[PDB]
Design a protein around this ligand. Structure first.
Ligand code: FES
Length: 141
């Protein structure tokens, strides 16, 4: 079966683990307290794309910070690292103008929940099928 199993037991706050799945990068960021708070400080009315783009929940879900992470605590942000414009790999480590990711191909910026805030990309970075199967492992797929 296609599913893969990623050990995230050593991922510290502020670290992104990047793992290849279906030929493309998946970003698994363990968010910092600053990342979480700022994601939660954005109002839906401020967002370019209000859809959660999240394979794990209803396809009409709103892009609240809570609908962008695997966990209620908001520490685990798992997304396809594939720009929604033309597919370049977004640069992270708190890059761009919104404390998230920046795509240098044409200047798109995503926030700390991976939501699109500026540039030509039309959508929030999509979230793959992903869930914890115990304390240390995320199943992708
Ligand atoms: S491919 Fe990312 S902004 Fe164009």
């Amino acid at each position: 079966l296609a599913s893969i199993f990623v050990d995230v037991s050593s991922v510290e706050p502020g670290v992104q683990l990047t793992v290849k799945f279906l030929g493309k990068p998946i970003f698994i960021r363990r968010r910092t307290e600053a990342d979480i708070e700022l994601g939660r400080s954005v109002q839906l009315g401020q967002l370019v794309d209000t859809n959660a783009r999240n394979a794990n929940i209803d396809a009409g879900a709103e892009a609240t910070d809570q609908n962008r992470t695997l966990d209620e605590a908001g520490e685990w942000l798992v997304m396809w690292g594939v720009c929604t414009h033309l597919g370049c790999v977004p640069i992270g480590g708190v890059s761009g103008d919104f404390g998230g990711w920046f795509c240098p191909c044409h200047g798109s910026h995503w926030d700390s929940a991976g939501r699109i805030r500026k540039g030509p990309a039309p959508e929030n970075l999509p979230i793959p099928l992903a869930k914890f199967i115990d304390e240390t492992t995320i199943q992708l797929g």
